[PDB]
Design a protein around this ligand. Sequence first.
Ligand SMILES: C[N+](C)(C)CCO
Ligand SMILES: [Cl-]
Length: 113
Amino acid sequence: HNREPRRIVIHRGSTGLGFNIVGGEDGEGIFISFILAGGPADLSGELRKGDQILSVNGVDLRNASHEQAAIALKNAGQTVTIIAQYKPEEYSRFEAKIHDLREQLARLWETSI
Ligand SMILES: C[N+](C)(C)CCO
Ligand SMILES: [Cl-]
């Protein structure tokens, strides 16, 4: 898999981008948790679950809060230029939050874009 940052351009009409984000803790970043089948992100075929979102329309999200990221993505207009970087090892830390909890005995804080 390409692990280097990738410049992705999504064209959408008047809908969401059709993916979910998790993250926003300091040092954590903003990750794709889910891609909706038939949404603009899916149809493009370029984004994946476990991608970190580094930038949207020239707004740096590498250390954004969850709310900052959600608002930047929702308000990005119809031509969305994303810098993404595939980091599945870092992504598995979100899966470990739910796993660790069900073991130490649950949903992630997640927004649909
Ligand atoms: C409150 N949620 C995080 C679940 C969705 C909106 O950001
Ligand atoms: Cl660019």
